Symmetry: D2
Subunit: 392 residues, 4 copies
C-alpha cells in the first residue's frame, strides 16, 4: 500500500537520528542533519516530525546559533509540507538531571527543569505543535529510602499546574501528554503504567488539559496487554497521543519497528484504533513511531526501518478490516456474545429493588446449565489469526 | 515481640483453610472448620477474620443450613472477640463465572453476579464489616477479540454504582475496595495494576466510597515496585485495605508468607506504613495476610506459617523504627536531600512570571557544577540494609 | 492444507481431555473417554496419541480394571491406525509427590517413584512407544534451605541410570527425553531450561540414550528465545521430542494452541524444523501438541482447538517455504552474510601460528571501515514478516 | 567485620571506573586512573583486580604508549601487593563488533576477534592471571533469520579450540570461563544461561580447561534462581569464577552492589559457597564484584559502594554460619529431611530386579499415609530469615 497524509504517520528526529551508542558500545552511525531528516521523512510518507529541544538545538547553543537552526528547520518544513504535531523536552541526558528534572531531590534542579520546558513550550507554540509530551525518564529511584514518592507526586503536580497556567495565559492551546515507563534508566520510574499516569492526571488543577502518551514497548516491559491498556485509556478519553514500536517482553527497552515485537498485539491494537464505532477510527491523533533502527544498520537500514513502520501499520490495517468484514467472523462474534456486553445488565428503569425482586437472577437461576455452555473464543481467535496470515 | 489487637492483623478463612489443591495436583490437607479457624487465629494474635461467601457457606446451601453455619460462626466470634473487618464474594470458582461475573459476555451471568454480591453485603453488614473487597479474577480475556474492554468497563461501573446505591440506601456504611491483579486465572485481567484500578474508581458515581485493596504479590507479578505503588495509593487517599504476602517476580501467584518474597521491598513497605507523617502510621486499616501455607505442609506447618506472617511484620517494624531513630541515617537522609523534595519548587507567591525573571533558574544556572555533586544514595541504602540485618 | 500421517501430529490424552479445573475454579467440562479421544483425534488428522499412566488407568485401579482399559485402548488404536510414539508417568498429582518423585526428601517416595515409572515403561514397550518423556514437575523447592540441589542431581541421576539399565537389559529400545520447566507447580524446578537439561544428561552413564523434550511455553516463561534454544538442542543432537503450544511471556503456564502466543517465534521455529539441511527437515520426530483448550470452551471448542494446532503449523510451514524460495529473500540473506557464518574462520590447515602471522587479521586491519558497513538485518526481518502475513 | 586477602575479593577496573554514561545520558563522573584504582582497592581490602584489555590500554594505543601503561600498572600491583586473578577482552564496544566477535557473520571480524584475544592472553600470562573470562556480549541477534545458531556455535567452538591450543602450547596454564547472559545488548545472546554455557563447553576439544563465570544479575534477568544454578555448576565442577552483583528481576542489567537486589537469594548463595562439605567453602576462587556505582554518585559514592560489596558479603557469611550452627535449625533440618536426600534411593548392590521384588516400594506402599505428613519447610525458612535479620 501507500501512506497518505491522512494516515498521520509522524516520527521523532531522535528515532531515525539515533546514532546507536548503546549502554555497551559506541555509535555506529554518524549524526543525521535535521533538514535532511525532514526531507527523507517527507519522501517516505510521514506527515509530521517531532523532537526534543536538544535534538534540534545542541545543548548550550548561543541565541544566534539556536535562532539560526530554527529558521533553517522552518524552511525545510515549509518546502516539504511536514508539520510538528508534538514537541518534547530532554530532561534526562545532562548530568544535572541524574535524580530527575521535576522531582529531583535538589530544588535548584526542579526550578531549572521548569525553565527548560517553558522555553520549549514557546518554540512548540511557534512551530504550531498541539501537544507537549512529558517523559519523566529520570523521575524515580534505584533505592526506596532515597525518594519520598508522595512529595515527588506533589512536585510533579506543582510543575504541571504551572505549565498549564502559562500555556492558557499565553493562549498556546497545548494539550499535555504524560508518557509512563516502568524502569530504564531509573531502577523504578514514577507513573510506571498507563493506569498510574491516568490516575495522576485526574489530580491536576485543569485535568481536561492532560492525557497520556502510552508507548507499546513500555507496557510490554512489564508484560501488560498494550491493546487492553489503550482500550482503557480511550474509555477514560485520555489517549492524547500514542507511541508505536515493538518489544519482546520484560527486558531492556528495544524500540523495534512497530509489529516486530508482539505481532498478535500489534494486530489487535490497529483493529481497536481503526475499527472504531460508526465505522470510523476510535482514535484520530498522530500514529507516532518512537523506535530505533538496530545498531547493526547503516543509513540504508535506517530509511528501510522507517518505511517498515508504515508498511506494518498499513498491512495490519488491511487485515483488521478484512477480519471485521468476514461473515464467518460475524458468526463467531455472535456465538461469543461479544456485542451482548454492550447491552446494559439492568433493564431501563430497574434498580436494586427490581433486581432483588427478580427470582430469575438468583433463586431460580440455573448456574450449572449456564456454566456448561462454551463461548467459542478459540474459534474466534483462530479466525482473527488466519486473517492476519492472509490465509482467508 | 507479640501481636496486640492494636496491630490489626487479619487473615482470610481461605488462607489457613487452603487445602492445597494446585493446578497440577490434589489437595494435601483436609478441610478446616471455620469455628476452629476462628479459635486458632485468636490464639495466634489475629484481631479479625475475613471470608468469601462460599468459604463459610458451601455454594448452594439451603437457608436452614446457611443460617445454622452463620449462627455457629457468630458464636465463635463472640467467644474469641475476633471481628470481621471485610467480607468478599466468590465470583471466580463456579463454572458459571468462566468469562467473569460483572463483565461476562452473557447478560444473565452479570445479573446473577450482582445478586450474589448483594446477598454478601447483607451478611457483611450484619457481621459489622466496614469494607467489601472486589477481586474480579475472571473479568478479562485470553484473546483480544473476545472482549470489548470499553463495554466491559461500562458494565463494571454499572454494577458498582448499583452496589453503592444499595449500601447507602440501607445505611450499611460500607467502603468498596477493588483488588487489581495482572493475570491468573485469565490470560489478562481488567484493571491490572493499582494504577488502573485507581483511575477506574475515579469514574464511578460516588468515588468517595471507592478505593483499592492492592496485594504485594500481584504488583510483583508485573515486576513493579509495591512500596512505590502503595505510596501513590496513599497520595490519592485510596488505600482502603491492603493484602500482604510474598512473591518471586513474574510467575504464577505464589502467595508466600509476607516477607518471604522480596525482603527489601517488604522492609521499605513496613517503613512507609508505620513511620508515617507525625510519628504515626500513614495507614490505619487492617494488615491483612492473603497467603497460602505451602502444599508441602500439614496443619502444624499451617499454624507455623500464620504465625510467620505476624513475626515477619513485627521484626521489620522494629528495624524500620531503629532505622529512622539513627542519627547516622538522619545525617545520610540530609546529605541525600530526601526532605528537600517536600519544599515547594516555587517560592510562596512566585508564578511563571517571577520564575521567568529569575536568571538563577536558567540564564545563570551552572548545570555542570550541580550535575557533578553526588547524592550519596548508595551509602543511605547500605545503612538501611544494615538496620534490616540487625548489624546496627 | 490438510494433515497427513507424514506430518506426524500427536496429542496427549490430557490435552483434549483437560477438564479445565484450574487453580481458582472447578472443572467446566466432563471427562473425555479415551476410546472416544482416539477416534476424534484420528478424525482431525493426528497420527499418534500419548498419555501419562494415570490419564488412561485411574490411580489405583485393580489389575482386572487396568487390564480391561488397556485392551479397549489397544482396540481403538487398531481400528483407527493411530500409534503411541511416546508415553510418560504422572509423578506430580498425588500428594505423595508434593516434594518430588525422584528427588523427594523422603527416601520411600523416591523408591515408589521408580517403581511407578518401571511399570509405565513396560506398558509403553507393550504399545510400541519409542520415547519415555520425564517431566520432573515436583522436583525443586519453594525455599532455598529445603533442597540440597547437589544431592537432588545425584538422586535424579541415580534413578535415570537404573531406568536405562532396565530398558537396555529388556531390549525395549527406548530413548529418554527430560522435559525442562522453570517453575510451576514448585517455586523453582530443577533443570529449568533446555540448557540445564542438556548439561545434566551429558553426566549420565549412557548419555547416548538421553535427550530433551523442550516445550515452547516453558522456555517463554523465562522470556528465552524458543527457536534459538531448539537450534542449540539440534546442534547437540539432543532434540528427542518437542512439545508445541503458546504462551505470553513470564506468567503462569498458559498452554495455548501453538502459534497463539509469540507468533513471530512460532514462524521462525517452523522454518528451523522444516527448512533443514538438505531441503529436508532438520527434525524427524513427532510434532506433539501439549496444550489446553481454554476453560471457556465446551467440547465443540475442544475439537476446534485441536484442529487449530494442526492448522497453525501447516499455515506457518507454507509461509516458511515461500520465504526461503523468494529471490528477494535470497538477496537479503546474501547482503546480511548469513551463509558466511558457515565458512570456517580459519583457512584449511591454519592454526594460531598462521593466524598470528597474518598482519591483515589485526595489525593492518581497518576495524573502523568494517564497523561502518550495515548488515541489512531489519530489511531481512521485514521480508520474513511480509511472507508471514501473506503480503508477498 | 574486616576483609582479608583470604576472602579473595576482586573488582574489575571497569566497575569503580564506570563513568556512568548509560543508554539515556552522558557520564556523570570523570575517568579513573588505573594506578589510583589499584591504590584505592588495595586500601578497601581487595586482594586482586581484573580488567578488559581496553580498560587498561585505550583501544589503538601504539606499543610505546601501551608499554608505558603496562609498566606503571605493574609497579602499582607491586607496591600494593594486589594480584590479577583474571583478565578479559573487550569484544563488544567497538562498532566492528556490532554483530559479535567470534560469531560475527563477517569472516574478517571473526579473524580479528581471535587476534584481539590472543594478545590479551599474552598480557594475562605476563601478569600471572589464571583465568580468561569470555563474555560474548554481542554474540546473538535481534531477529531470528539473521543468525544461523548452529553455524554460530560451530564458529564459537572453532575459536575457543584455537585459544586452548595456544595456551597449552605456550604453557600459560589458563582456565577459560564463559559468562552467560540472556540479553542486552543483543535482543537475545547465544548461551543465555549457566545451563546453556555448561552444555556448550562439554562439546569443546579440551573440555577440562573450560567452565563458566555466572553473574548474579544475568540469571536473575530471566527470573531464574541464582543459588540453585550455582549449585548445579558446582555439581558439574564447572564453577571456575563468579561475578557477584544485584538485580531486581527481568529488566535492564542494573549491576547493583551484591545483596542490594534479591537479598534472600544473596543469603542462600553465601551459605552455598561458604558452608561447603566439612566446614570448608564449596568454592575456592575469587569472589569478584562486577557491579556499577549508581549514576547519581560521585567518587565518594564510588568508594562507598566498593566497600558495601565486601560488607554485604561478610555480614551474610556471618549469618549463614550462625544459621547452620543453630541447634534449632539443625533440628528443623532433620524434620524436613534435607539430609535424607543424600542417602541413595537404592540399597547397596540393589538393581531393577531387587527393586521390582520389593513390595514395600509399590504393592504394599501407603502413598496416602505418606502423602499427608508435612515437611516443615516454612518453619525452616522462617528460621533462616530470622538469622538473616539478626533476630536469632
Amino acid at each position: 500500500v501507500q501512506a497518505t497524509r491522512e494516515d498521520k504517520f509522524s516520527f521523532g528526529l531522535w528515532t531515525v537520528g539515533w546514532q546507536a551508542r548503546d549502554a555497551f558500545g559506541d555509535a555506529t552511525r554518524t549524526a543525521l542533519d535535521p533538514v535532511e531528516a525532514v526531507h527523507k521523512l517527507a519522501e517516505i510518507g510521514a506527515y509530521g516530525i517531532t523532537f526534543h529541544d536538544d535534538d534540534l538545538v545542541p545543548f548550550g547553543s548561543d541565541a544566534q546559533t539556536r535562532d539560526g537552526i530554527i529558521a533553517g528547520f522552518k524552511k525545510a518544513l515549509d518546502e516539504t509540507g511536514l508539520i510538528v504535531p508534538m514537541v518534547t523536552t530532554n530532561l534526562f541526558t545532562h548530568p544535572v538531571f541524574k535524580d530527575g528534572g521535576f522531582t529531583s531531590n535538589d530544588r535548584s534542579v526542579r526550578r531549572y527543569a521548569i525553565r527548560k520546558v517553558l522555553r520549549q513550550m514557546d518554540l512548540g507554540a511557534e512551530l504550531g505543535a498541539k501537544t507537549l509530551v512529558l517523559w519523566g525518564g529520570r523521575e524515580g529511584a534505584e533505592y526506596d529510602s532515597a525518594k519520598d514518592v508522595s512529595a515527588a507526586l506533589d512536585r510533579y503536580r506543582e510543575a504541571l499546574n504551572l505549565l498549564a497556567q502559562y500555556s492558557e495565559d499565553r493562549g498556546y492551546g497545548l494539550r499535555f501528554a504524560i508518557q509512563p515507563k516502568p524502569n530504564e534508566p531509573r531502577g523504578d520510574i514514577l507513573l510506571p503504567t498507563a493506569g498510574h499516569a491516568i490516575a495522576f492526571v485526574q489530580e491536576l488543577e485543569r485535568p481536561e488539559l492532560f492525557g497520556i502518551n502510552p508507548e507499546t514497548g513500555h507496557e510490554q516491559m512489564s508484560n501488560l496487554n498494550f491493546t487492553q491498556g489503550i482500550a482503557q485509556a480511550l474509555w477514560h478519553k485520555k489517549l492524547f497521543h500514542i507511541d508505536l514500536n515493538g518489544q519482546h517482553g520484560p527486558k531492556f527497552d528495544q524500540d523495534l519497528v512497530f509489529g516486530h515485537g508482539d505481532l498478535l498485539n500489534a494486530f489487535s491494537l490497529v483493529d481497536l484504533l481503526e475499527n472504531g464505532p460508526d465505522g470510523a477510527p476510535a482514535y484520530d491523533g498522530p500514529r507516532h513511531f518512537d523506535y530505533k533502527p538496530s545498531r547493526t544498520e547503516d543509513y540504508d537500514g535506517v530509511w528501510e526501518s522507517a518505511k517498515a513502520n508504515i508498511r506494518m501499520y498499513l498491512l495490519l490495517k488491511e487485515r483488521a478490516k478484512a477480519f471485521r468484514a468476514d461473515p464467518e467472523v460475524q458468526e463467531a462474534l455472535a456465538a461469543s456474545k461479544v456485542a451482548e456486553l454492550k447491552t446494559p445488565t439492568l433493564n431501563p428503569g430497574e434498580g436494586y429493588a427490581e433486581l432483588l425482586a427478580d427470582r430469575s437472577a438468583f433463586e431460580d437461576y440455573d448456574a450449572d446449565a449456564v456454566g456448561a455452555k462454551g463461548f467459542g473464543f478459540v474459534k474466534l481467535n483462530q479466525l482473527a489469526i488466519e486473517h492476519l496470515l492472509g490465509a482467508r
